[PDB]
Design a protein around this nucleic acid. Structure first.
Length: 1077
RNA sequence: AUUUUUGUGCCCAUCGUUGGCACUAUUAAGGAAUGGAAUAUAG
DNA sequence: TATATTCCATTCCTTAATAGAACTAGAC
DNA sequence: GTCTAGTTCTATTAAAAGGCAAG
């Protein structure tokens, strides 16, 4: 039920005197310089692990003893790392020598793991551990004793303790609790419980715990058995009984005995170290005197990569074993035949160097249809061969040869329409070995080659050091605190200063490197967001109460837009442009405080201070845990449909609904509350622009810009075409340009299209790349309407940034072209620093736009869910589970387009945001068929699927539209289930308009348009509906789109709704029964 | 402990009327793709 | 126009981690 | 009375009696 997350506030360090900042910088430098020593030492400790140390351990995660040892003994690290490198062929030999036995499959798989041979190499950590014993003059027996103790205390191994605990048990010189005393006491409790196994009241249990401890109170029990530290659960029962909060609790005697019996092991030893003094002396020599806070701070940074890579590498090895087991090695000979293509004459290469073959080279499992069509040709050629008896038998055979090449070429072109184009030579080659290999075996064999290569190429994770950051806080860390708001008011009063200010102060216990002693110091920070949502004080009496979600934000119910005073508004106007935005926010904050509109924030020592030093810059982050209790009793489901070009959508469904609109969904009464599109509106004067969909101003208002662009291309409109069947055709760019220069066209589309044309001009004038340099700057940077100056968050705007990056690549590539030394970023920067800076500026702006799009889309989804939660109750947000969208088997353009979907990034932001609000839950569901299901009818109780639809006038019809409708009437079979819906849709289209296949098949687009206009004119209809893949509309049984109009399709009455709105309802309904189980 | 000028960013033919907005930070690798130049091949 | 490779660059996502809790002797 | 710097804390995964006569 308990859920935990953190919210962070980034800040700007406001510097004090240089000497004060130097003291802090020197301390941060000291911790950073120190961290690598702990990293090296912990690697040596891991190297000393052996079968004796891990004897009788836990079950871990199906990790074998061999794997646990191998991951400790051998690691992949940078070649220039201090540990000496080992060859991969020696890992098993070294393992046998250290282990005494040869490695098992898990350790063997780890050794076989792929890695980049030019950056990383295997390292022997056992040799590193030998270096520790030698360098510190440590007894092998003494270090083994300490290592064994460390394993029990979780200082080393699979499940590590915190750095703070590890530092304390290993190096702490403070008074330790006597472990034997706790062992005798826990043992006595176990004995008494066994003696009275049938007790059932806490009163009886507390009495048994008290008798075991020879005491009459928890306080006397703790002093004798657990003097220092957090209260053990067994002593908490006595304390809670003395408080009176657990008197009615149930008692599970077998469970208490079992849990107590498991802790016994930890208390059979007193943790008497034998080499800690020597190791501490070595550490003091390298990082200075032992301090729990400083050593613990450095150890946490050193430990994180070592522990994390061990966890990740163990899972990866186990994953590889299953993936390898999943391979069918029995198909290797079939794979061997297919791989034979490289040796065959069909494949031809200078060095005849091969490549990996994947299913898309044969068109996946669509080779079978090609085989049947090819067998039929052969069958007819093997049945008409008997009726020959002529000298020219070399006619028919050539007709069989030549028609085999058209069938294959045709297959490759058809498949290449909606996927990667298959390889003609490989399929020709494969047809030649038709008696040699069955077609199903060709697929199994090609699959084996591809699947084997993918599994074998997966790389091991190298162990890389961490760039460190240090934590300051109230407890178990370096001492630090944010001055509290009350202390700030008191400090200001005592200083005869203004009651409020815009700065945040921290006090941290820091080491003075000169004296090597601790000193508390004060530092200043600035963060407007922190001040608004947390820090600024609600000084006025009877201020609004603190918000349920503690943060003071608009989503949490605080608008923060109070009426400003004339002196306040003049302060904003009076300030420079660079400070006006922050001044307005500060003035607005002061107004809400004065007007008593600012809600209270409940202060606590809840914010961690993280400091990271890069150069002379300090990055300070304030983060606080946010606690949430799950609310499983959902009243509303919010479905979200993620789209790429089209708008995203949401649909809300009330569960356990009663009333006029209730629908009975498989015994669950539900009501479709509402659906909508996600838009992010920004006000400009009196109009508003949706950041998500705006494509820019029409060219009508950018004539100077277009003419300026048109003038430059004219001087470089000259361009040839290598694709003209021999002699290239010198075509004209300007004809292409005028098409996109229409006054009606959007600026972003025009700008994106112009970059592509400019790329073509440059490709056609390679020797004159330098000439375009000035034009690119005005287009991308300097121009008033340049890409950098104006762009929305619409898909087209993102594509415009992508093409601009490509054009800069083309300018640079052509600029440095020559007929061996590769061209690097250093070369480009020296060649054109301004152009290179421009490419970086585009990258930085695009990343910022992407982050902004994820946050604004996430905000809209969370706001709607919060609105529904306040109205109805707990809300479950459902998103589509989208994965593995980009594939090598698809064309580059599809993968390129698919990259901007951003469904996962938005979903990840929603999941994090959802964790901050009670009554909100987020899950992902299978998106299968969500675009074709008829919501509230499908699965209630029959499967109901329908085609997507397009709506246009007869004039707007295109040849593609005509061909698409005929394609659905083909009646050729498909492995695509959606194909039937489009077929039924096309059948419905002919019936609804009183048509027949011959009215569309073999009819000119002109004839087709007039036929539809005549029907529509008789029916007094402006537009016609036709089934189209990715069609904007869906004919729904229910009114799920607010703007939907009723229509009678094939004698059935349906609502014409936006297809995406229908989809959001469908996403909400996937496995909806499971959400109310 | 006082700096008083800044947490990070998003949108706009008019960059202001107080213009309109939004947001968990960091470390490190891995996975899957894309762009550019050129090469080989192919009907 | 397709396939495939090499080299220089890039994006979007995933998965290992960090951002401790509760306590008391002893220092004020 | 307070505050800090030091300590230990959490999973669950236990064993064996019970079930049978005269002696």
């Amino acid at each position: 039920n308990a859920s935990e997350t953190r919210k962070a506030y980034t800040t700007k360090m406001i510097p004090r005197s240089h000497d004060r900042m130097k003291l802090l910088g020197n301390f941060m430098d000291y911790l950073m310089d120190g961290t690598p020593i702990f990293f090296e030492l912990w690697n040596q400790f891991g190297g000393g692990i052996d079968r004796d140390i891990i004897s009788g351990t836990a079950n871990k995660d199906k990790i074998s003893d061999d794997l646990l040892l191998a991951v400790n003994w051998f690691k992949v690290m940078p070649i220039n790392s201090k540990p000496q490198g080992v060859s991969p062929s020696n890992l098993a030999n070294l393992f046998q020598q250290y282990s005494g036995s040869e490695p098992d499959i898990q350790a063997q798989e780890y050794f076989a793991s792929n890695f980049d041979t030019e950056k990383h190499q295997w390292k022997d950590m056992r040799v590193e551990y030998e270096r520790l014993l030698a360098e510190l003059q440590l007894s092998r027996s003494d270090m083994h004793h300490d290592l064994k103790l460390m394993y029990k205390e979780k200082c080393i191994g699979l499940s590590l303790s915190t750095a703070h605990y590890i530092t304390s048990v290993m190096f702490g010189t403070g008074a330790k609790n006597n472990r034997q005393t706790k062992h005798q006491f826990y043992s006595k409790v176990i004995q008494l419980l066994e003696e009275s196994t049938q007790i059932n009241s806490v009163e009886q249990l507390a009495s048994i715990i008290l008798k075991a401890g020879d005491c009459d109170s928890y306080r006397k029990l703790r002093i004798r058995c657990s003097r220092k530290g957090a209260t053990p659960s067994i002593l908490k029962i006595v304390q809670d009984y003395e408080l009176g909060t657990n008197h009615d609790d149930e008692v599970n005697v077998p469970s208490l005995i079992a849990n107590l019996k498991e802790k016994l092991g930890r208390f059979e030893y007193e943790c008497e170290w034998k080499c800690m003094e020597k190791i501490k002396a070595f550490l003091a020599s390298k990082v200075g005197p032992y301090y729990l806070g400083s050593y613990s701070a450095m150890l946490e940074n050193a430990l994180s990569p070592i522990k994390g890579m061990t966890t990740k590498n163990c899972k990866f090895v186990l994953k590889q074993i299953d993936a390898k087991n999943d391979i069918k090695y029995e198909n290797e000979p079939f794979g061997k035949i297919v791989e034979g293509f490289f040796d065959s004459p069909y494949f031809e290469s200078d060095t005849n160097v091969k490549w990996v073959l994947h299913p898309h080279h044969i068109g996946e499992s669509n080779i079978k249809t090609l085989w049947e069509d090819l067998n039929a040709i052969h069958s007819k050629y093997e049945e008409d061969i008997a009726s020959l008896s002529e000298d020219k038998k070399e006619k028919r055979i050539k007709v069989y040869q030549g028609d085999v090449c058209q069938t294959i070429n045709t297959y490759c072109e058809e498949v290449g329409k909606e996927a990667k184009t298959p390889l003609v030579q490989l399929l020709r080659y494969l047809y030649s070995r038709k008696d040699d290999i069955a077609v199903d075996k060709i697929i199994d064999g090609i699959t084996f080659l591809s699947k084997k290569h993918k599994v074998e190429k997966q790389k091991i994770n190298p162990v890389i050091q961490k760039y460190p950051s240090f934590n300051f806080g109230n407890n178990s860390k370096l001492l630090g605190k944010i001055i509290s708001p009350k202390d700030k008011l008191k400090h200001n009063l005592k200083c005869n200063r203004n009651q409020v200010d815009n700065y945040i102060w921290i006090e941290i216990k820091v080491l003075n490197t000169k004296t090597m002693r601790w000193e508390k110091h004060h530092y200043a920070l600035s963060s407007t967001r922190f001040l608004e949502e947390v820090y600024y004080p609600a000084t006025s009496e009877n201020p609004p109460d603190a918000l349920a979600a503690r943060f003071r934000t608009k989503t949490n119910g605080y608008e923060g837009k109070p009426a400003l005073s004339a002196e306040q508004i003049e302060q904003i106007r009076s300030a420079p442009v660079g400070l006006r935005k922050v001044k307005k926010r500060q003035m607005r904050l002061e107004a809400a405080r004065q007007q008593n509109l600012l809600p209270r924030y409940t202060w606590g020592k809840d914010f961690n201070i993280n400091i990271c030093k890069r150069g002379n810059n300090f990055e300070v982050t304030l983060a606080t845990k946010v606690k949430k209790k799950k609310e499983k009793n959902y009243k509303v489901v919010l479905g979200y449909d993620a789209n790429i070009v089209r708008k995203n959508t949401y649909a809300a469904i009330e569960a356990h609904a009663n009333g006029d609109g209730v629908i009975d969904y498989n015994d669950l009464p539900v009501k479709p509350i509402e659906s909508g599109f996600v838009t992010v509106e920004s006000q400009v004067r009196d109009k508003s622009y949706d950041q998500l969909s705006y494509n820019g101003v029409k060219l009508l208002y950018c004539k100077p810009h277009v003419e300026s662009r048109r003038s430059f291309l004219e001087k470089y409109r000259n361009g040839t075409m290598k694709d003209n069947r021999g002699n290239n055709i010198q075509i004209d760019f300007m004809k292409d340009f005028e098409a996109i220069a229409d006054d009606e066209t959007s600026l972003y589309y025009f700008n994106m299209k112009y970059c592509k044309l400019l790329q073509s001009s440059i490709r056609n004038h390679s020797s004159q790349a330098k000439e375009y340099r000035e034009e690119i700057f005005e287009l991308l940077r300097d121009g008033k309407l340049s890409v950098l100056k104006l762009s929305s968050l619409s898909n087209l705007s993102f594509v415009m940034f992508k093409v601009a990056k490509s054009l800069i690549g083309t300018y640079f590539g052509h600029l440095l072209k020559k007929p061996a030394p590769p061209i690097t970023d250093e070369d480009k920067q020296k060649a054109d620093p301004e152009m290179f800076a421009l490419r970086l500026a585009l990258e930085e702006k695009r990343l910022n736009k992407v982050k902004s799009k994820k946050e604004v889309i996430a905000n809209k989804i969370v706001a709607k869910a919060l609105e529904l939660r306040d109205k109805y109750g707990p809300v479950l947000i459902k998103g589509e589970n989208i994965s593995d969208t980009t594939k090598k088997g698809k064309k580059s353009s599809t993968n390129s387009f698919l990259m901007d979907w951003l469904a996962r990034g938005v979903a990840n932001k929603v999941k994090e945001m959802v964790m901050m609000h009670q009554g909100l839950e987020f899950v992902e569901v299978n998106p299968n068929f969500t675009s074709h299901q008829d919501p509230f009818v499908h699965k209630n109780p029959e499967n109901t699927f329908r085609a997507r639809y397009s709506r246009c006038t007869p004039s707007e019809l295109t040849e593609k539209n005509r061909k698409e409708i005929l394609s659905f009437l083909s009646d050729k079979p498909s492995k695509r289930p959606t194909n039937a819906y489009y077929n039924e849709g096309a059948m419905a289209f002919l019936a609804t308009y009183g048509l027949k296949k011959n009215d569309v098949l073999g009819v000119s687009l002109e004839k087709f348009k007039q036929i539809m206009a005549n029907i529509l004119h008789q029916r007094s209809e402006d537009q016609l509906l036709f089934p189209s893949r990715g069609g904007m509309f869906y004919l729904a049984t229910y009114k799920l789109d607010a703007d939907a109009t009723s229509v009678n399709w094939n004698g059935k009455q349906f609502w014409v709704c936006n297809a995406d709105l229908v989809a959001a309802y469908n996403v909400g309904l996937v496995d909806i029964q499971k959400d109310f189980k």
